[model samples]
Target chain A: FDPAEKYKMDHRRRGIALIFNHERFFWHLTLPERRGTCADRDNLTRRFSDLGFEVKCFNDLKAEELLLKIHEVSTVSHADADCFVCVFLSHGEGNHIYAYDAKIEIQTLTGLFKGDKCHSLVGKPKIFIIQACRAGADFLMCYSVAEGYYSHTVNGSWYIQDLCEMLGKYGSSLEFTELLTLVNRKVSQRRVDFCKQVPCFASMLTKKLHFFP
Target chain B: FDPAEKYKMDHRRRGIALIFNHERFFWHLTLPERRGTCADRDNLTRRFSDLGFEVKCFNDLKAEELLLKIHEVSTVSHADADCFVCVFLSHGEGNHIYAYDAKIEIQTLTGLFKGDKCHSLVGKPKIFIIQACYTLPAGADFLMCYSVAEGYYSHRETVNGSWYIQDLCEMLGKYGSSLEFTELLTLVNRKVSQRAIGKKQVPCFASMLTKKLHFFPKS
Candidate 1:
């Protein structure tokens, strides 16, 4: 009977989440995959898919290619969709996110989904989750920390791990906006040396969005 | 009876929560008090008190004073207490939490209740509710829940206290007497984030709770 549940039960409202995980930057060729990202991707894929999202993942895309992917994904016909979820897991600072080779402006990615450009998503929830570090922040190296950002990494980035776990546990009962908050809290609690991280998200949701997956 | 309720009822154990609210911080000297903090402290005291806790509050403590207060409170008279709750409301960064004008190492604060130091609280649930911008490292038998994630700001209205504490108080007041602790917090998490609206905020909880925790026995 919860409004969020009521919204989910409306059946006509199905959505898709575009997940882009850039594991390594070619500009930094000496580095390997952003170690824990794959785990994040796998968990996100399974969880979002379970929640009835049509999930698409683009791994290790270069700056220009990442741009093209967003443009293409945004332009695709989404008449049947009710909301949009985009997640970017990569390296970079606050203003920019890295592709496989170079950094791209964060706005460049989000701009593609503007209601004018992605007409089908107008008046609908537009949620963007950027897992990248901002403002010349340290990109967590798994081996150095023995795990997820400052913790053990069998699952993945601490930020994504908490997100996936919370989503998995409460997805059916809680709203998406609420779930993201838990992710932020969980990530904030981890102490890895002087490093600190928080998952960032923006939502233009006109209504409460819940996934009963 | 709910299974968890049945489990907690077996013990007939009551708990205590130590609330430390540093309403006046040096950095924000112009203000006499963190305007919204008193409300959070008031709400917390009432909610936990309603759930059978001997809620005690320490206000505007200095760093060393805060640390000593925790040691003193945590080390004394928990024989009748089943769980321990500590609420901290002050300015803080990812590495350290604030205590009035000074910073206290979070580890130093939490280390006092290690099993060896505070035997009475060992193996019992040690929960820390932090209203700040970052995270921490907790010990065994501890559950650490925070107001916001790292590198981001936490919000508090001039009068509403904080989204996290307000929702937590509301959820616990509404459900703490019936639902298990985790369930109560789940509701809190949902409420905090939903109310955040355009801004990003959420309550995150990390647990070493081996089993469900029920604050009140079923009627």
Candidate 2:
């Protein structure tokens, strides 16, 4: 493949954007309420919808419900779609993220869409954008923070807010990875109580991705 | 800053390109020899020198000597230079890369160049390219380009050097004068990812770079 080639994004639809937004948690779990995530969810929904995605938001789901819903979406054919995107906003540590009732291994959530499990989406870009406390595969895996680091939030997450802003501002003009680099710059420049957050990405993308409007 | 603004790469010098090339290890350390790294070192030396850098290559330095050499470089004034570049070619696991005789924390090497420690390099782009087996803050104008993502294997040929470094040198040779630095890296990512045979290797980069970076040939 030529290095200059881009992923074909001219399908009939831009594809599904599944947002698993967790806020309040079960009392037994002791996970704090993700107070500002709703704003992040709304911001992402608007920004992605502007890029022609059919946005679907699921809020505060139990572990079983989250799995079932994502699996159901994975099983559906996406041959006519341009790509797939999944976003998770919650409190997470290491490789596990919390559902309303339990902590689910992040791999379990993303593994459902691997090539063997989801055939119609093969060779198509599968982007996983996570805005949890911390963080690949054709998968462009974007994390709000580098591994073993804390991600910040107030009215909205530093990573998600900057990400949505970058998406809204330059998503059309810049290459997708380049746009994400800008997001990294913006997030790193932010200071919350003298602590720092640096976002990271692992690209398995063989071609450039452009969300051309 | 405007998103389109670029780093100033037109200083009296294009700054230093430091290559820490680790090929062999101590017998008791149980680390295997890293073959083909000499080719990587040579390729990087030629490529960076062509871009007007004062390229320096260090071979098989023990952990203490390696740290001292880099710390000494960090203490020097880079006020007249455009930016800084450091490359590591070695066998590594997780966040530590093996030196000639011991493992060095990646941060120990990078911490010396932070804004407070290396005042002359503050606000200037500092690029660290690591081609170790595994894999950083400017406390902002820094870029960490890793040969492979964490927990992944880095590929190198016995005679040809690494997939990441070889492709990186080729890209620097071809488009070093015209393309944005990160755009060039994205191309390198594509080229290396496509070269995977039995095992897969995907290059990753973390950028706190605030501007577009172009290595237009020095006039």
Candidate 3:
């Protein structure tokens, strides 16, 4: 959908749900995975709560179990909701989220909350934030086009870590599209053999959407 | 906080946080109390979360209990956080958040999270959204004026509602202030009172601002 049309609104009155799934029970926590979730989660919640959305955060979950909550929250009767926001943090294999104990296809999980299935949110918006990987085994084995340039990594996964770090810094400052484009570049430029970039995006047909506080 | 300085940036990012926080559970439920914690709590959460602060919701807590989490989050020991925001949903007595059973003065909570105490966030935005009251029993009764021809009687408050919040909401929309303010709160106050004809209840907005921060930036 053309995002331009959807980006306007009376936002102080919207409803919201954010699922932050971080499970180290699957693979490894290596060096970069160290901060405590309680505070980060708390801080994140307060951010949205201030904006006027009722928010709920879920921690560690099994792959299928996680799917259940995502589906329930997404497709649930919107008699009380206006939007859905989810954050997936796990291992990965190029667009795949590493579900604890097993890796689940991101498409399979997200595709279920079909716009039609979630008819309650027909005119509303849904946002997905993946803080995992979009790379295969050859993630870090590439040569940096320019010396000293490191591929984005979070335990060998190259692209996504750069994104999270970038989002934390630039997301607050840059318009969503501007920041996301840079991310598309830093990531796609490092992709093995593609001149084309794999874009991470927000897909919603809502006529009007604006996430104001 | 000049609307002129932040027009472009503020307009574009006006609803950035809401994109993520406008979930159903955020504010669609009914609170049990004249002001219930968890009931209005989610709705308030949905409100502010949509406004753009990460949110954490607790079920039931006294005033002191609420302060405990506030103290920890605002502490310098844990400093990866850039800013802090919160909304309290409970029984209130005019501008005060009922701290469950504890009844701690809401101001004291804000004082603790001050820029000096929570020095790490000095010059950073720290906001507390208390869904309560701050007025005393004595409220403005009414006022009257004569127009060009006939006499106009202005009635302000009754027993059941808030003239201040009502005026605030209506005028805010009327002036189109939502799209302009660098600091949205200031304009919210301005429109509310400007629309009021003096006899109307003026809102009590207490701010402990350290540094000026704009959720909606200037382009």
Candidate 4:
């Protein structure tokens, strides 16, 4: 294999960026309103758009609607795209994230785009940038906090703010994984109410990903 | 942060490379003998030695002995070294790997060298290369390079060693001093994925690493 081989980012389009932004949950769900998440969604939409994604945001979709919308997107043809991106900005615990009224396993959501399921994205990058409370896959799963940890938020989440900052500053200049490392460091170093948060990413990507032109 | 910044590798010594080589399992453990793991261990020892590590191999240690030996090493002051590395070549399922007698969680082995536990190695890269069947932080600077993705089987050949380690050794031999470590791992990922043994295996890594890590030869 060529040592310099990278995920092809030169397709007709850079593909879609889906942001599942969740701020408030149903009273029955007993989850707190995520006050600063709108700021995170806006920051990410801008960053990904600047990187040339067809950015779309869905606000507080219920669990079924969330699943349906994502499945619909997964079924579409991405043959003309460079890659795919999905962001989850909400409350989460363990491996599940909160929708408007219920929580859904992240894998149930991401499993739609597996190579066998979404053939158009077989060799392409499928990036998931998740900003929520504790949890955990393939396809580059970036978490706001490590598993079994709390994610702190005030005006904006520590992880997404730092991630956006890094993306804005170095998104076009650095390799994507390398840029996430910087985000890890930046978020890890922040002082949040005497609590500690360390961001982590698990990469199943087979090639270096650079969002460069 | 400089995009070019890398972990400082200039130290009095290049540091330790511990190889936990498991070839056979206890009868009651119900694990089959791992035939080609010795080849993997020897290859790793030679490769890491050439790359300037003080390589040590522990063969067939029971669960207790394995943990004790690793804990002893973690207590040592690595202030004079550049980084630390530990390799697990064993039979594994889910998040645990087999010792000679029992299954041990991968995290229990790696948690010893975390920054809080082993202060001397804090901020230095702690790399754990596991070539097992299946699979964090200061609670930074870690690169967990697994041989296969979770819930998947890792491939081994009775003669050629495991696919991931062979390719990894080759890449390290060819480009250890030059390529960024993660990029080299990507090459290993591609190589292992391309192997056709009637099964699919894709190696993956979880990085909390804050800077580029290169296994450049020790100065």
TM-score of chain A of each: 0.71, 0.84, 0.54, 0.84
Candidate 2: list runs displaced more than 4 Å.
A1-3, A24-35, A91-104, A134-137, A147-155, A189-196, B24-35, B62-68, B91-105, B134-139, B151-153, B196-199
Residues B1-219, model 1: lDDT tens digits:
111212233334477777876544335432223556677888899988887777878765465675666667856866556778878776433223344232354455566666667887755778888776344454545666767645444564446577788888887877787765655665665566567343456456655443456766423
Task: Write one digit per residue (lDDT tens) for candidate 4, span A1-213.
Answer: 789888888899999999877544423333233555666778888999999999987755465676667667878999999888988776543233334233344565577887767889888888888775431123888877775455664356678888999989998998888899888778777744446366788888878888995
Q: Considering the two chains of model 1, state its CAPRI-style docking category.
A: incorrect
Model 3 Cα shift for residue A69 (angstroms): 3.8
What is the Å distance of residue A81 in model 2 from its true position?
A: 2.3
> What are the TM-scores, per candidate, against the unseen true structure?
0.56, 0.83, 0.33, 0.88
Best by DockQ: 4
Q: Cα lDDT for residue A91, model 1?
A: 45
Q: Which residue ranges in model 4 land beyond 4 Å of their true spot?
A: A23-35, A92-103, A134-138, A192-196, B23-35, B62-68, B92-105, B134-139, B196-199
Q: Please, what are the lDDT tens digits per residue for candidate 3 over residues B109-177? A: 455554446555443344444334231110010000000001112232223323333332333334322
Q: Candidates' lDDT values, in order?
A: 0.58, 0.73, 0.37, 0.74
The best candidate in terms of TM-score: 4
Return whichever of 2 and 4 wins on DockQ. 4
**Candidate 3 TM-score, C-alpha based:** 0.33
Per-residue lDDT tens digits for candidate 4, residues B1-219, read 566788898888999998876544433332123445666888899889988999988855565776677667878889999888988776533223234232344566677886767889888888989765434333467778888786665653555577888899999989888899888888887888887433468788878787888777765
Clashes of 2: 0
Off by over 4 Å in 1: A1-13, A17-21, A25-51, A61-63, A71-213, B1-12, B23-39, B60-67, B74-82, B91-107, B110-124, B136-167, B180-213
| Candidate 4 residue-pair clash tally | 2
DockQ of all predictions against the true structure, Cα-based: 0.06, 0.32, 0.01, 0.50
Give me the candidate number with maximum lDDT.
4
Candidate 2 A-chain TM-score: 0.84
